[PDB]
Amino acid sequence: VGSFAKGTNVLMADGSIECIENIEVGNKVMGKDGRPREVIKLPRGRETMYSVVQKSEVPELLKFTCNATNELVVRTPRSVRRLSRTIKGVEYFEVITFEMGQKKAPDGRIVELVKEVSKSYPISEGPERANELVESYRKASNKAYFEWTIEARDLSLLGSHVRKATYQTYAPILYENDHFFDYMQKSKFHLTIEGPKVLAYLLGLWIGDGLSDRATFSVDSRDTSLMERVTEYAEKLNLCAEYKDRKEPQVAKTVNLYSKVENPLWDAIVGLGFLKDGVKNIPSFLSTDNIGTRETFLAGLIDSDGYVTDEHGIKATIKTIHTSVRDGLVSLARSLGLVVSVNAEPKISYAIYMSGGDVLLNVLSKCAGSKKFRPAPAAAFARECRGFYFELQELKEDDYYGITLSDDSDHQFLLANQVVVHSSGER
Known part of the structure; x- marks a missing residue:
């Protein structure tokens, strides 16, 4: 049963933050769709641990510690490309793809993971075939990425291209x-x-x-x-x-x-x-309050001490001299679904950079600043989960605390830091 370390902060269904070890059956944790997730069990035990840390200059890294058997909720982008290469005097049409495959693990288990697959056919035989593949791939899924899970301990089994392209996610609140x-x-x-x-x-x-x-x-x-x-x-x-x-x-x-x-x-x-x-x-309650209020609040902040640029994508920068506000801002912004990063200006000043497409346009459309305002999205939009690359560090053994959800649930809940983690259960 995958679990987390003691002290792991979990986001409750009501928007409150709680330490996993203090969670008791009956309690409802926060579901990524905003709805509650009833806790029905509380796994306990010892096991090697793995700390999950975002790969990335004021640090604001997403992280949490889990056990080795904990299922990481990850995404890997789908990918396909056709190229022509000459192998040993013979020209081939080659299609390299990312697809779900298998890999024998050290303990003999068959682990299902995304793999980089290559297929080549001699040019003499023509393209059709290579197309019947590139074509079947592009229309094999309505998604542009794979949604799956891998146990921490099994993350090392991934090839280099897939591992680096694989990311975890944090959901808006x-x-x-x-x-x-x-x-x-x-x-x-x-x-x-x-x-x-x-x-x-x-x-x-x-x-x-x-x-x-x-x-x-x-x-x-x-x-x-x-x-x-x-x-x-x-x-x-x-x-x-x-x-x-x-x-x-x-x-x-x-x-x-x-x-x-x-x-x-x-x-x-x-x-x-x-x-x-x-x-x-x-105020901490902001993050879990009315979305419209969160955006309006940011629009004001952006209007008084920030600027907007659009060189390589819409992006907003708010400057704050206080670290209290800073970290409060990063939290409030991430709660809307914005992508955030922080840097230290001449550490006296702090710049919080925010990006996010329609999510950011929905905030800027509320500003009044001449160079701040941007028209609202061209249509309704869902606040997609955002990904973050990470590093895994194998730790010694310690006590672990897991949370089990219902049988009909999506089997996922959010940590205090909005990171989408998997329920603690057998399989």
């Missing part, structure tokens, strides 16, 4: 709390349907470049689009976006949001916890 919404209700008595939107946005601006002792943040002047947004939004919360305006020689216009009748914005900043212990913080 589709479950949605309402800590933010439920908060709104507790606020005043009357407020527009777009109250949650407007506040999350303003909080993003605050976290971006706002003072830590007052509902005041700075914004760029040449950005008339962003200004109209602040003003427009403040008003939605009966606030005044006050600033010296064109009578204060400067480029970074300080914007003061007063109660305009101890106000909504700041009451949330403290109530929700965007400022814990005098220092800025990214």
Whole structure:
């Protein structure tokens, strides 16, 4: 029965994080589709362990420790190519492919794994055949990759090209709390349907470049689009976006949001916890809250202290001087399905790079910055699981804790770090 090490953090069905050894039958862990996964057993035992680590300069590596028999949920890209080569004076048509095959393991077991297969036919016999293969491959699957599992210990059996192309995955968090919404209700008595939107946005601006002792943040002047947004939004919360305006020689216009009748914005900043212990913080509940709220929040942050580039794909960069926020950002961004990486600018400053196609466009379409806004996706889109390459390190023996799911379930659940791992069970 594959398992994990003690302390392994698991994401609960309700969005809470829990240490695997503290999990008890009946509890529901988080399913990758956002739905619960009831725990029905708790494997125990000793066994060689393997630490899983992302291969990759501020580290933000995805990782977890498992036992040797733990089934890694992996994906390998499908692949096909035809080439012509001359072998020993004879020209051949060769088709190299990635397909599911077999390999005798050290213990004599037959392990089913993706393999790089090669097939060649003499040119004299013609192409058809090579095509009846390249053709059957391309239409043998509706997917562009293989979805499978391999035991940690068996990962060494993979050929070099397949091993390097094989990756694990972390799923976006589709479950949605309402800590933010439920908060709104507790606020005043009357407020527009777009109250949650407007506040999350303003909080993003605050976290971006706002003072830590007052509902005041700075914004760029040449950005008339962003200004109209602040003003427009403040008003939605009966606030005044006050600033010296064109009578204060400067480029970074300080914007003061007063109660305009101890106000909504700041009451949330403290109530929700965007400022814990005098220092800025990214509330942990964000990650598992309303998706629209998560995006709106990021759009604000991006609008106050970040930039967007499109050279080699749409990408957003947010700069933060605090490590608390930094790691909070990486978590919140990954929860939407964005691909994230961090670097240290002249370590005083921190840059969080985010990419993700439609997932990123769904955030930027909420920004107001002149060079930040990007039109929303051209259509509905699913938030695909993201892959990460990894390194496996064989460890000595230790106690392991596994979790078994129902018989009808997909047999998968998420770790606190969103990594999609396999249920602990026989087979």
